Design a protein around this ligand. Structure first.
Ligand SMILES: NC(=O)c1ccc(F)c(F)c1
Ligand SMILES: NC(=O)c1ccc(F)c(F)c1
Lengths: 367, 367
């Protein structure tokens, strides 16, 4: 109803909220942010059935407590064009006035009662995340997940909690490749020894913008609520049974090669100028790369020397998807990587030599 | 047929050539760059009926002179993924081989005889441009020209040469606004005392990427050829008669106000958060800005103090298009601008206080 706020505090809060608004129809409440002034806090939220964010900023002054709404895109556009001095926000019946020095604006509010109730859960599982490993895993695994996947449970990331062993397993897949990590020594508070949540990709991406470390993750098996000092975020979970990835992962590998990450990146990028798939050939002191599904009369080839010789009898040949192989290497923190293989026709593994550590299993390309 | 070249020289030449290729159909000669090795130069060109570029780079070594062609997008994609060391280019019948250390590529060449003849003109008009004023004019005027304009001659920029007075006039318009400059003391060599060329917008944009100063501009009234040390560019000219802009420009102005450029930019940007048109009100010591065609219940207002008072009897009101007014101010080099008006319903002028100097005439918005 009446306050002053810091321009930068307000702008930053509004930026984050943009992604939770349906902006195209400005006449719908789904384009508005809900506003609430109580004590010395402005609360801003945007949500619906699926997903939502609640944020707050401190008022520089507060004169009048109450509630309202405002078009979030328009609000952000106005504040962005203002100077750093404090901004006065003030209702005038069903209109919000915005003032700074000689500049003043009016926007219409809607009925705040039309705004969805921001949900709260009775948590069945809860963790406190005090380090970046979880978001690191999220970031490294996200590229393998197809948001528009036509199968529902593969459109999100698996979080598998084992309370008994204090581990959080995180898994993404598109059916051609599967990336995973298991995070150790996580103090999990749960009503069950084993429990699984599937977060939608859309939610995953939002979390990467909002959180880094020092946040809680809580779930009742229907919603996941993530919270820190300034923000409360929620998303609906995805219903199905995520693939048994432990069954999918091979038992052992016939061969394991320790290889140069950046040299393989460069070599693959290079051959991928003319194709999407590549023929890798490994010899004792050499790795050869050749474009595979290139159009005829178009070829790309290169090789790198392997100084510390491989354990090979003549030559191992492997067809690979370039993008997938690169994204697997991109997920690694080490200067070297381990490539574990069985037959050239069976899935192969990429992982770090010896933050989360993300491994990727991958289907090869034939011939 | 056989040479080595510097990677950076080759990459840079290829980047410029990209815009002269139809890249989507890789099976057509229109996706290829023509190649010619003679003396210690590789000549690269891409052209068609409308527009073209010829470039050259120096060979580090030359062994075999001749001609061929290559897909320009693919060539650029390959070279971009290579290291800085020299690159060997070498024909193998109707294929171009590209080699650097352990990396080698083949791409197919097409019949070089299918490539269009690069045109040459007998110039009717010629200038040497030894300073940036021309491209400065081009850059400042380009925003007012609609490339997809449904009327042909307004889809380009007018260049009007007066050999008698040694002036080059440059003019753009979209019918709502007209931006112009007249450049003085240009040594024009022409067969006529007065002559006009209309360059297409597409060509204008290319010229801005390729040229700055120390180039020749030549025309036969059908093509324009622009040339410097490394590059020869051409474009077809547009046929019609460009509007008589000297008739269009007003005789005198009832009032002329000297105003703050950045303050007006900020004020207009600010009000344009909620509208495309703005009501400007000028008073003796004040300028007020208000959103005009904003949706109802949405308002944006601001004002700035004018210390050195205006010559006004009460208040001058003027409806303006925000984007147009901003782009007019963006074209100015001065910290202040002059706004010249007659009736609030008639065209008004924006120009610099007291490089090219671009003035913009503009139709107002009513009420
Ligand atoms: N989920 C699967 O069916 C699958 C099987 C083999 C793979 F290599 C893979 F990446 C995924
Ligand atoms: N070319 C025209 O018809 C024209 C007339 C008045 C203007 F203000 C203008 F910018 C253009």
């Amino acid at each position: 109803m009446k306050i002053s706020v810091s321009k930068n505090d307000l702008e930053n809060a509004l930026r984050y909220l943009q992604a939770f608004l349906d902006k195209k129809d400005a006449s719908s409440i789904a384009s508005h942010i809900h506003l609430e002034v109580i004590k010395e806090k402005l609360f801003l939220k945007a949500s619906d059935s699926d997903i939502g964010l609640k944020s707050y900023i401190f008022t520089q002054s507060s004169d009048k407590e109450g509630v309202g709404t405002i078009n979030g895109k328009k609000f952000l556009d106005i504040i962005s064009c203002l100077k750093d001095s404090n901004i006065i926000l003030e209702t005038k019946d069903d209109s919000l006035a915005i003032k700074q020095n000689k500049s003043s604006f009016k926007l219409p509010m809607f009925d705040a009662d039309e705004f969805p109730e921001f949900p709260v859960i009775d948590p069945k599982v809860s963790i406190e995340v005090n380090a970046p490993f979880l978001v690191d895993a999220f970031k490294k695994i996200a590229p393998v997940i197809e948001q528009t996947s036509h199968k529902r449970e593969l459109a999100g990331i698996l979080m598998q909690f084992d309370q008994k062993h204090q581990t959080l397993s995180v898994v993404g897949t598109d059916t051609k490749r599967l990336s995973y990590t298991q995070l150790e020594k996580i103090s999990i508070h749960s009503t069950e020894e084993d429990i699984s949540c599937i977060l939608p990709k859309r939610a995953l991406l939002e979390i990467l913008k909002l959180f880094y470390e020092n946040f809680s993750f809580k779930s009742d098996g229907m919603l996941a609520v993530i919270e820190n000092e300034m923000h409360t975020f929620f998303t609906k979970l995805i219903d199905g049974n995520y693939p048994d990835y432990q069954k999918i992962l091979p038992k052992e590998y016939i061969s394991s090669f320790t290889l140069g990450k950046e040299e393989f990146k460069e070599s693959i990028k290079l051959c991928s100028s003319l194709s999407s798939t590549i023929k890798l050939t490994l010899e004792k002191n050499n790795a050869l790369f050749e474009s595979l599904d290139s159009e005829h009369s178009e070829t790309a080839k290169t090789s790198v020397e392997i100084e510390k010789g491989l354990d090979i009898e003549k030559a191992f040949h492997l067809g690979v998807n370039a993008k997938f192989f690169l994204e697997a290497l991109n997920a690694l923190g080490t200067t070297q990587f381990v490539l574990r293989c069985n037959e050239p026709s069976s899935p192969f593994l990429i992982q770090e030599s010896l933050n989360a550590k993300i491994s990727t299993l991958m289907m090869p390309i034939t011939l």
